[PDB]
């Protein structure tokens, strides 16, 4: 069942990109963050990291992750993966490049695993707000209340609703290829991968080879140290150069498609009703800001709505045509008068 | 040859006038003001910044009092407390129960951040203004002269020599008291040296970053340590320099009228377009040529082609030249009604050559002088609908 | 210590210095022109103050932090007007 | 070239003091903090802790901290040196008594290492805010601009 | 409102007048910073009338 999505599993491989605030500065972390998607109602977040979470090298180890360490990857466990904001979050599911989590409200989002001798985290400035379903401006899902048709990301991953292009990555520089052949700069190969190669000085001008040596130039900081390694494909990230050869296809399904689920919503304390001649008096004791709306049923609607936070007592002139009001998300009520 | 002329003070506006030199061919002029630096004289008063309460270790005699001394440290507040029973990780500190006294002292010293971030008070005087002038007159087509405004200093770059100013307006955007904060300028009224109220601006006042002595009125007052613990609780007003940093007014470089901008500099206010300059210039007679060489262009006529009642050079016109010989011919309109961007035109035998100009009158009736040949180019103009151009170059708004 | 304050003057490890941080840039406003008045249709992402300053004799300055998207106006006189939206470079403007 | 600061390294020793809010009360922690200088712009904070981390007992192990426990000092690992605010911070560098770290805005700053069998944390009340340089009052250093 | 408009959910053609302008990449770092107006639909989703 879980091995029925090999389009992403085997054909894609995580790469390294330029994290805005990696650790303490702008480094090139392997967990570079893309496309933070804070649009769900219940504060659920989707994050697209450049590291590939999910299966092991071939098809196994859901509890493992795969990042890219220099020119080669090394799949390890998911031991201490953590996604964090103003307050630490709680991860829900990880799959491919995408992570699903439930974060508190906050202004910055961070993603970071723990290799064991190092942290290797990344973070990006991107605010994530809480938007409570309905008319009751709460801050966390309550344990009870009436449910409403919210919109939220689904924890499932075996979906084909949307796709994202996965072309052959651009080539990557690796100056550690450029060893020294005692007096000339010297280039090895990872596995026979294509090493685009040339220097400022006139020498070998293409580089589609095994381990070459330089005839002309001398300095490792004056040669092109590249690796075309599109035996494994990468996401169409805006942080990697694009190989001018051609743009590969191979679009794979997005893990977490938004769905129209049903979230529990808070229920404000019921009003204390009191009355005088042709006059409703309404006592309100809200715990959180909740929108009150009112509507006269006569020819003139004469609407009135206001957010109320502090406990307050309000009134309403109830004509014989009658009056409706909707405190919180309680069913609307309506009345006559003497 | 000595052509004195008053000039409006604008940066990106030419002054292509014409020299009416008798006995020789008239020569056009052209003067441009690249900069109008003012550079008022200034005198530093003091510099203020956040402070740091460098509290030394307390003096704690276990059994007996200890009178404190009035040290010369700035705002050196010292007070002795009685009846204290300090604990530390190693147990209670003394065996006496009432003779324990603590001698706590503290003084205000300017923060380490003062070396980089610090306000600067300045009292300024009138000073003397300078300008960079470019003159592309005659055939030389170039100048790169830095000049003053005093009505005595000659400027003799290249071949020509001239004198500029003094300015008609003594307007100075700077006030008598000026406060400079790193890069922006505020005309805040700093009180004086050694008088700053605590909490307000200039709570800590230093003569200079090098100067050891300073004036620190922070209302610092120590208080008794609580529940028998070794520390120095000190109560003081919040850093006055921190205040007025988050609620300062608009910088002078953002409220100075006449489009004047300032810089972290001798405090020149460049491009301060105001007033006029009485420009006088001595053209060398070498550039002059015998009048008997200029071709005669008499019996000509001027026809308007298309004038736009706008600020850019929308006005065009064709002149039916009636000349005899061939050569260069300066063109200039003595009247200020219209300004001609075109400077020189070569004359063929009875030719016609269009030129561009700009005007500000619906029916412009302006004289046109063409190398000693007068002609009036009367015509009509049309206002534009898309008022999207560079800044106006006609500079001739008047009754129309 | 009642004896004396010994030597050992020790340098501060991390001295503040005037480096160059990278700052945010607000989205460019949508400029709409009318007859002798400038309408600035803009949408700020974060609270930014904009300043306006007439180039005539009277500055008539105005500083105003704005957070929600808003539409503002400005009477651009023949002298001209200049405005600074956010940390963008200042821009000036004409009037016909 | 890190051996040209022996005046700090050798002439100084670890130190202990009254932490106002050491854990649940005011104990005497070895990492009592003082003079936090939160006056920069990029969100960085300089903290002067009582414990003096740096080289090891004699001249080595820059990546080790040395605090004082009881009568004696004890140079151990720096595994879980934690600096916290309203949100957890991130360490940058440390030298002598002073540790340089950047924190999100918050009302209190806490410092805590890990001996391994012990928590040994300390905090203090101190306003921390960071207004970025410029006219755009943001709240986190952006990617570009 | 209506910053992005599509004739139907499946319509491959659409209109998007969002003032999207690209920006110079900062400090020789490989990225594509773009200057973009805030989402038009997000507005009027926080301040919609009754
Ligand atoms: C007594 C009564 O009618 N009460 C509500 C009253 O508490 C409130 O101050 C007023 C405001 O208009 O409306 C009234
Ligand atoms: C203060 C001011 O002049 N605001 C006006 C605004 O009320 C008007 O709606 C807009 C054109 O729609 O020009 C803007």
UniProtKB/Swiss-Prot annotation, chain E:
What is the membrane topology listed in the Swiss-Prot or TrEMBL record?
Single-pass type I membrane protein
Cellular compartment(s): Virion membrane; Host cell membrane
> How would you describe the post-translational modification of this protein?
N-glycosylated.
General function of this protein: Class II viral fusion protein. Fusion activity is inactive as long as E1 is bound to E2 in mature virion. After virus attachment to target cell and endocytosis, acidification of the endosome would induce dissociation of E1/E2 heterodimer and concomitant trimerization of the E1 subunits. This E1 trimer is fusion active, and promotes release of viral nucleocapsid in cytoplasm after endosome and viral membrane fusion. Efficient fusion requires the presence of cholesterol and sphingolipid in the target membrane.
Quaternary structure (record): The precursor of protein E3/E2 and E1 form a heterodimer shortly after synthesis. Processing of the precursor of protein E3/E2 into E2 and E3 results in a heterodimer of the spike glycoproteins E2 and E1. Spike at virion surface are constituted of three E2-E1 heterodimers. After target cell attachment and endocytosis, E1 change conformation to form homotrimers. Interacts with 6K protein.
Question: Mind telling me what this protein is named?
Answer: Spike glycoprotein E1
Q: Which residues of the full protein are shown?
A: 1002 to 1051 of 1242
């Amino acid at each position: 069942d879980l091995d029925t999505h090999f389009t992403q599993y085997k054909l894609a491989r995580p790469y390294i990109a330029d994290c805005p605030n990696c650790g303490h500065s702008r480094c090139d972390s392997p967990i570079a963050i893309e496309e933070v998607r804070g649009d769900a109602h219940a504060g659920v977040i989707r994050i697209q990291t450049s590291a590939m979470f999910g299966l092991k090298t071939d098809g196994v180890d859901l509890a493992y992750m795969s990042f890219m360490n220099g020119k080669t990857q090394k799949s390890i466990k998911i031991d201490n993966l953590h996604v964090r904001t103003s307050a630490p979050c709680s991860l829900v599911s990880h799959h491919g490049y995408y992570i699903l989590a439930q974060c508190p409200p906050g202004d910055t989002v961070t993603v970071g695993f723990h290799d064991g001798p190092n942290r290797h985290t990344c973070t990006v400035a991107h605010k994530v707000e809480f938007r409570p379903v309905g008319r009751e401006k709460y801050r966390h899902p309550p344990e009870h209340g009436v449910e409403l048709p919210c919109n939220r990301y689904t924890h499932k991953r075996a979906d084909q609703g949307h796709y994202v292009e996965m072309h052959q990555p651009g080539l990557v520089a690796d100056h550690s290829l450029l060893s020294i052949h005692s007096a000339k700069v010297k280039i090895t190969v990872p596995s026979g991968a294509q090493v685009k190669y040339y220097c400022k000085c006139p020498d070998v001008r293409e580089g589609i080879t095994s381990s070459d040596h330089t005839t002309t130039c001398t300095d490792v900081k004056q040669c092109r140290a590249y690796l075309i390694d599109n035996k494994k494909w990468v996401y169409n990230s805006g942080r990697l150069p694009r190989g001018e050869g051609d743009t590969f296809k191979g679009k794979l399904h997005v893990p977490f498609v938004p769905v129209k689920a049903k979230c529990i919503a808070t229920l404000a304390p019921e009003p204390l009703v009191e009355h005088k001649h042709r006059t409703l008096i309404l006592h309100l004791h809200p715990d959180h800001p909740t929108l009150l709306t009112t509507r006269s049923l006569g020819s003139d609607a004469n609407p009135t709505r206001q957010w109320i936070e502090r406990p307050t007592t309000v009134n309403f002139t109830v004509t014989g045509e009658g009056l409706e009001y909707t405190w919180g998300n309680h069913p609307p009520k309506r009345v006559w008068a003497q | 040859y000595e052509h004195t002329a008053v000039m409006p003070n604008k940066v990106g506006i030419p002054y292509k006038a014409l020299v009416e030199r008798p006995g020789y061919a008239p020569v056009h002029l052209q003067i441009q003001l690249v900069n109008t630096r003012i550079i008022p004289s200034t005198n530093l008063e003091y510099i203020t910044c956040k402070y740091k309460t460098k509290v030394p270790s307390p003096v704690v005699k276990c059994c007996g009092a200890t009178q404190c001394t009035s040290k010369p440290h700035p705002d050196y507040q010292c007070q002795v407390f009685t009846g204290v029973y300090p604990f530390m990780w190693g147990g209670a500190y003394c065996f006496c129960d009432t003779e324990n006294t603590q001698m706590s002292e503290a003084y205000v010293e300017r923060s380490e951040e003062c070396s980089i971030d610090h306000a600067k008070a300045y009292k300024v005087h009138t000073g003397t203004v300078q300008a960079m002038v470019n003159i592309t007159y005659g055939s030389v087509s170039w100048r790169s002269a830095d000049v003053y405004v005093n009505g005595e200093t000659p400027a003799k770059i290249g071949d020509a020599k001239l004198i500029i100013g003094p300015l008609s307006s003594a307007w100075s955007p700077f006030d008598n008291k000026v406060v400079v904060y790193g890069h922006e300028v505020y005309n805040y009224d700093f009180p004086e040296y050694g008088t700053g109220k605590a909490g307000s601006f200039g709570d800590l006042q230093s003569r200079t970053s090098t100067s050891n002595d300073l004036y620190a009125n922070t209302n610092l007052k120590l208080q008794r340590p609580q529940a028998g613990i070794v520390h120095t609780p000190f109560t003081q007003a919040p850093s006055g320099f921190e205040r007025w940093k988050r609620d300062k007014g608009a910088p002078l470089n953002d409220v100075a009228p006449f489009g004047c901008s300032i810089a972290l500099e001798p405090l020149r206010a460049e491009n301060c377009a105001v007033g006029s300059i009485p420009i006088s210039i001595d053209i060398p007679d070498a550039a002059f040529t015998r009048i008997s060489e200029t071709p005669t262009v008499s019996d000509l006529e001027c026809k308007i082609t298309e004038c736009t009642y706008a600020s850019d050079f929308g006005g065009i016109a064709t002149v039916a030249y009636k000349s005899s010989k061939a050569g260069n011919c300066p063109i200039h309109s003595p009247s200020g009604v219209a300004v001609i961007k075109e400077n020189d035109v070569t004359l063929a035998e009875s030719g016609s050559f269009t030129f561009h100009f700009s005007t500000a009158n619906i029916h412009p009736a302006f004289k046109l002088q063409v190398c000693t040949s007068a002609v009036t180019c009367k015509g009509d103009c049309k206002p534009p609908k898309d008022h999207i151009v560079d800044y106006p170059a006609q500079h001739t708004e008047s009754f129309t």
